[PDB]
């Protein structure tokens with residue numbers, strides 16, 4: 001009886017195995033655009049993905065992860081609110097059963113159809129397991145997805161999903177360029193928070209871009225054909241794999257833009 005997103009094991013139950021679920025810096029949060037303060041001391045974000053090496057795509061029973069070689073500084077995030085160099089390890093998404101829900105962060109209570117998380121870890125801690133134990137261990141770049149025009153750079157991901165339909169399935173996934181998933185603007189909000197799934201560790205500097213990307217209805221429909229279950233188990237579609245907004249508590253959300 002492990003955690004997940006159903007009635008009996010979903011977000012409102014997580015605190016029983018993971019007490020930090022009720023902590024002081026949990027994620028996601030609602031971004032109140034009028035209360036966020038412009039911080040003119042925040043630097044432009046530096047996204048350096050030209051040498052990125054994607055390796056594999058994995059259905060882990062909660063989402064699918066596109067994994068990267070993070071054994072060298074090849075795809076890194078710096079600048080913005082960050083001190084130091086953070087290495088891209090994987091990206092994944094959270095999405096809905098309907099286009100009106102699916103994102104984890106909200107903007108003035110608006111839910112997007114999905115949200116992309118590009119996960120990076122602070123190289124001063126040596127590797128990812130060590131980084132998640134530190135309050136500045138990870139930087140997760142969050143990007144909202146709305147349904148409209150297709151995102152051509154997403155299509156290679158959409159088309160391999162039938163090969164990883166069920167939990168524990170993986171596929172080779174080389175040469176995928178995550179630059180094709182970025183909006184034009186890197187204007188962002190930033191605050192200190194947590195992993196949005198167990199173990200819910202409070203180790204994340206969140207950097208959420210204001211500009212959503214558009215994906216097509218057909219692209220998101222293909223996310224919703226994935227399964228939470230393993231092969232040979234009863235079929236339960238992988239939809240609504242999002243945690244709702246958590247209390248902001250004693251935090252301020254900062255804007256890079258006016």
Ligand SMILES: NS(=O)(=O)c1ccc(-c2ccc(Cn3cccn3)cc2)cc1
Nearest residue numbers: 117119128129140194195196197198199
């Ligand atoms: N991007 S996000 O949705 O907040 C998000 C990102 C990462 C994880 C995550 C992190 C660590 C583990 C366990 N672990 C693996 C190696 C060492 N520890 C499992 C999941 C959960 C949610």
Ligand SMILES: [Zn+2]
Nearest residue numbers: 093094117196
């Ligand atoms: Zn995530």
